[PDB]
From a paper:
These proteins, human angiopoietin-like protein 3 (Angptl3; also known as Ang5) and angiopoietin-like protein 4 (Angptl4) are, as the names suggest, related structurally to angiopoietins which are involved in angiogenesis via their interaction with the Tie2 (tyrosine kinase with immunoglobulin and endothelial growth factor homology domain-2) receptor.
The Angptl4 crystal contains 1 molecule per asymmetric unit and the visible polypeptide chain begins with Leu184 and ends with Met400, hence 6 amino acids of the C-terminus are not visible. There is one break in the mainchain of Angptl4 at Gln370, suggesting the loop that it is in is flexible. Similarly to Angptl3 it contains one disulfide bond (Cys341 and Cys354). Analysis of the electrostatic surface potential of the fibrinogen-like domain of Angptl3 and Angptl4 revealed that the electrostatic charge is relatively evenly distributed over the majority of the surface of both molecules, except for the presence of an extended positively charged patch at the bottom of the P subdomain of Angptl4, the surface that is most likely involved in the functional interactions. For Angptl4 there are two reported mutations (P251T and R371Q) which are linked to increased triglyceride levels. Of the six mutants made in Angptl4, three gave no soluble protein (G223R, W349C and G361S) while one resulted in greatly reduced protein yields (R384W).
Residue numbers in the entry: 184 to 369, 371 to 400
């Protein structure tokens, strides 16, 4: 069995879809691979119609949930079995309600559960994401869900005030795992939506997202 999508690409697999892989120290599981000029990408998240509830607790974000032929979240322990401790490219694809698309890419490291699946960002990459003052040693941002939220403020639970699970560095940078919306609701619920502040705004609900990862 191939270790990951990139191994699949490297033996000549051309089609994007569902394939059986087995990383190190993992049981076999079925991934979504995307085959591109750039090689094999692992699809770790995909949203496009609001048919799958993303407002799930810690254990569901670890194991994964959703339809692998539709909207889904692959699962932090599956993603981390794929990346290991290797530097990885993370691709983030957004789509607004006018058909426009926005393609972003960041090199990251992803810790395991001992780190609560923290994203480890160098200072330049954290600068790319809008952090204006960061130590030269960078930034790690743990994953948070409503039942396991890492906002240090005794008053505030970021995941619980919004929706879904995410790397909430702040509570207003992004959340691609929020509540899916089609049109304008009555502000206090748009807070809880699918958003990426620096593209269409804090309160603009995205039509579609994909996240993909690829080691190195």
């Amino acid at each position: 069995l191939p270790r990951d999508c990139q191994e699949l690409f490297q033996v000549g697999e051309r089609q994007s879809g569902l394939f059986e892989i087995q990383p190190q120290g993992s049981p076999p599981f079925l991934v979504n691979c995307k085959m591109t000029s750039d090689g094999g990408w692992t699809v770790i998240q995909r949203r496009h119609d609001g048919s799958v509830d993303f407002n799930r607790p810690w254990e569901a974000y670890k194991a994964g949930f959703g339809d692998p032929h539709g909207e889904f979240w692959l699962g932090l322990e599956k993603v981390h079995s794929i990346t290991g401790d290797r530097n990885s490219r993370l691709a983030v694809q957004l789509r607004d309600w006018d058909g426009n698309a926005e393609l972003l890419q960041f090199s990251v490291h992803l810790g395991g559960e001992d780190t609560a699946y923290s994203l480890q960002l160098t200072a330049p990459v954290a600068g790319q994401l809008g952090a204006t003052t960061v130590p030269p040693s960078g930034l790690s941002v743990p994953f948070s869900t409503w039942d396991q939220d890492h906002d240090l403020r005794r008053d505030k639970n970021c995941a619980k005030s919004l929706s879904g699970g995410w790397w909430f560095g702040t509570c207003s940078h992004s959340n691609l795992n929020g509540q899916y919306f089609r049109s304008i609701p009555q502000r206090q619920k748009l807070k809880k939506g699918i958003f990426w502040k620096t593209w269409r705004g804090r309160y603009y609900p995205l039509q579609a997202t994909t996240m993909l990862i690829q080691p190195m």
